[PDB]
């Protein structure tokens, strides 16, 4: 369960790192020079934090929505690991987390 939690948390951290700016790819026509290609790379890299930009009509840039995901799987796996560890150690789970129900309390 420790390894399960570790993997889930690391993957969630990476996914948090990737959200926000969408991955985008720039295209150039034949006969583009190395200086112009480096310029295009710099522009594409800056477009995420740059609100505006201009390119020749012969060039194109597309946006892809890189992540388009949710954290629910990782949270569920971490909760499972937490519950397993609590049961194995203390024999119960209430002592570590607040029980959100009554009646059977």
């Amino acid at each position: 369960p420790y390894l399960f939690r570790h993997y889930a948390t690391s993957d969630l951290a990476e996914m948090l790192e990737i959200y926000g700016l969408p991955i985008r790819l720039g295209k150039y026509p034949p006969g583009t020079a190395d200086e112009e290609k480096a310029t295009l790379l710099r522009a594409v890299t800056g477009l995420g934090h740059a609100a505006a930009g201009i390119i020749p009509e012969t060039m194109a840039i597309d946006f892809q929505q890189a992540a388009q995901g949710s954290s629910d799987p990782f949270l569920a796996m971490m909760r499972q690991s937490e519950d397993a560890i609590s049961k194995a150690v203390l024999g119960g789970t209430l002592t570590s987390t607040t029980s959100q129900s009554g009646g059977g309390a």
């Binding site: 150039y28 026509p29 034949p30 006969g31 583009t32 020079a33 190395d34 200086e35 112009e36 310029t39 295009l40 710099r42 522009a43 800056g46 477009l47 934090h49 740059a50 609100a51 505006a52 930009g53 201009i54 390119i55 020749p56 012969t58 060039m59």
Partner: protein, 137 residues
């Protein structure tokens, strides 16, 4: 000045330039430098029209393909009357097609002698860019 009188001679022989450049003496005897200079100027002007959107117009160096294109255009311009079927007209149209290809980003401007030309800063432009909270605070 992407080409000179010497370039035109070395491309088209001297006798043909003597024929097409002299309008006063029949048979021609001497090359009139003014007409050749104006033809070269017009060729340079058309090339500038085709190249202003991708490079700095006052080029400090001339690519060799630019020299060939300028010489061809000047020779075509030197004709008072030119038919559609004239081979020089076909060569001029071919050179214009190359110029259009260069303009449309389909062909590149090659070396001048050893270094690259000076691409203009069109694509460089982007907003200032706001990325606070990512400066290692």
């Amino acid at each position: 000045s992407y080409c000179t009188l010497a370039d035109l001679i070395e491309q088209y022989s001297e006798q043909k330039i003597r024929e097409v450049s002299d309008r006063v003496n029949k048979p021609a005897t001497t090359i009139d430098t003014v007409i050749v200079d104006r033809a070269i100027a017009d060729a340079d002007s058309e090339i500038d029209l085709h190249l202003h959107g991708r490079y700095q117009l006052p080029l400090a160096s001339v690519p060799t393909a630019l020299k060939r294109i300028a010489c061809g255009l000047a020779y075509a311009n030197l004709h008072i009357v030119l038919k559609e079927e004239n081979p020089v007209y076909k060569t001029a149209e071919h050179l214009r097609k190359l110029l259009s290809g260069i303009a449309n980003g389909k062909l590149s401007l090659a070396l001048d002698a050893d270094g690259k030309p000076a691409p203009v800063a069109n694509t460089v432009q982007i907003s200032e860019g706001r990325n606070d909270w990512g400066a290692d605070w």
